[PDB]
A paper describes a structure:
One of the main functions of RAB GTPases is to recruit actin- or MT- based motors on transport carriers, allowing them to move along cytoskeletal tracks. This is the case for RAB6, the most abundant RAB at the Golgi that regulates several transport steps at the Golgi as well as Golgi homeostasis. Two closely related RAB6 isoforms, RAB6A and RAB6A′ are present on Golgi/TGN membranes. The interaction between RAB6 and Myosin II is critical for the fission of RAB6-positive transport carriers from Golgi/TGN membranes.
The RAB6:KIF20A structure reveals that the 603–645 residues of KIF20A represent the RBD. Both RBD helices participate in RAB6 binding, two RAB6 molecules binding at opposite sides of the dimer. The RAB6:KIF20A interface is formed by complementary surfaces of the partners that mediate hydrophobic and polar contacts between the molecules. Prediction based on the structure indicates that substitution of these polar residues by bulky hydrophobic residues should substantially alter the RAB6-binding site. Indeed, the KIF20A (529–665) fragment with K629W and S630W mutations lost its capacity to interact with RAB6 Q72L by yeast two-hybrid. A myc-tagged version of the KIF20A-529-665-K629W-S630W fragment overexpressed in HeLa cells remained mostly cytosolic in contrast to the Golgi-localized wild-type form, demonstrating the importance of the RAB6:KIF20A direct interaction for KIF20A recruitment to Golgi. The mutations do not affect KIF20A-RBD dimerization and importantly its ability to interact with the tail domain of Myosin II.
Residue numbers in the entry:
A (entry chain A): 11 to 176
B (entry chain C): 600 to 648
C (entry chain D): 600 to 646
D (entry chain B): 14 to 55, 59 to 175
Write the structure that this text describes.
């Protein structure tokens, strides 16, 4: 049961916590509860090859907690960078987030870029093409999700798990 | 060689255990701080009268 | 012997560094949450 | 040489450390949250590493691990509060559970300056220390009484 650390990063209210909740408990809550500093969770994934335990480090988007995050990026195996497809600023900031991750880990880190809230179709401001082009520019994995609809959340974690070192 | 492998194993085990210990401390610290302050915030929130 | 002394030196060092790193995490985590929640409590207290 | 400070709420754990560290004292009560760390030097090169723990119940579960790594345990009570004194038995038991007999323990009766409010006699403190086989001292963090001796006596007992 090898252990791996996933850190979740992104601007406030993009859906970092909701993605984790959907994966862990297959549930969703519309009521917003901002992450305070950081939250620690754990989940085992019984892959075909072996079993792995994922430590899930759910960081806050609130600016006041930014100083906490570097050490967790530094000690993480995977960085999941989330934005909100209905919010252009959140997407524009992902270059900065991926910059920070590379700064701490270089190429020795798996990065997944996530465009969340696909269910809010008429509010979309970031096309799936834009998200895909950004991820390719930065050589990171890409996926779009809806924590609310439960769309592509399992796929997100399966893709990440499959990329883990052996 | 065999000397480097033996020490790598022991260094890995120490890293694994210390990670386990301190990540548990961080978690408990987070939960305790949260629980501690939420009560104090709840008390004052109860006072809407 | 010479092997045990060499590995003990590296284990001691690794332990010392990890202690430093994780205690810094604990400290700054606590300080961040304290500052935040005190302001929250003050706001309730100021009304 | 790690020292962990243990005891019920508001007994003077932090004040003793602050008096020894900075020779300052605050009458205003600020409850310790979680566990705080400090370090200091004090005829030999003293390398004191102090762990100041919370008396608040909410943070009790954090303490055990720190007792394991602490070579010394300083268990503090308030001479004006008999319950704080009674609980030191439990505290010392826990130190034994984590360290057995390979630990230096100092039982501290603090706030000697509050003579008019003393609920615990020095004889009672001395008795408990003998019964539990630990060191004993009475202090006043406020006055600075026996604070230097507390650390000097604990230091001299280090391996
Ligand atoms: N419609 C829709 N809403 C979502 C989705 N995911 C999250 N939300 C909502 O967006 C808000 C923010 O979700 P969170 O998971 O708390 O976002 P976060 O990134 O963890 O926020 P911080 O921790 O403060 O940085 C909440 O009200 C959620 O219910 C989604 O996929 N679709
Ligand atoms: N008169 C007098 N008051 C003291 C003395 N030592 C501490 N105090 C007071 O007692 C109160 C508690 O002091 P602290 O050092 O914060 O007690 P503590 O054990 O660290 O409290 P917790 O961290 O909550 O467990 C404060 O108001 C101090 O000013 C003392 O020696 N004499
Ligand atoms: Mg969150
Ligand atoms: Mg204190």
């Amino acid at each position: 049961l090898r252990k791996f650390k996933l850190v979740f990063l992104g601007e406030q209210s993009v859906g970092k916590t909701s993605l984790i909740t959907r994966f862990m408990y297959d549930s969703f809550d519309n009521t917003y509860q901002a992450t305070i500093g950081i939250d620690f969770l754990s989940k085992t994934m019984y892959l075909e090859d072996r079993t792995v335990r994922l430590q899930l480090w759910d960081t806050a988007g609130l600016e006041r907690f930014r100083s906490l995050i570097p050490s967790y990026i530094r000690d993480s195996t995977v960085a999941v960078v989330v934005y909100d497809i209905t919010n252009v600023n959140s997407f524009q900031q992902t270059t900065k987030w991926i910059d920070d991750v590379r700064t701490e880990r270089g190429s020795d880190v798996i990065i997944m870029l996530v465009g969340n809230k696909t269910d809010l179709a008429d509010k979309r401001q970031v096309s799936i093409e834009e998200g895909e082009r950004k991820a390719k520019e930065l050589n990171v994995m890409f996926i779009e999700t809806s924590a609310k609809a439960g769309y592509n959340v399992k796929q997100l974690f399966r893709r990440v798990a499959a990329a883990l070192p052996g | 060689g065999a000397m480097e492998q033996w020490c790598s194993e022991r260094l890995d085990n120490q890293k694994e255990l210390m990670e386990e210990l301190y990540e548990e401390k961080l978690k408990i610290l987070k939960e305790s701080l949260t629980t501690f302050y939420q009560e104090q915030i709840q008390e004052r929130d109860e006072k809407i009268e």
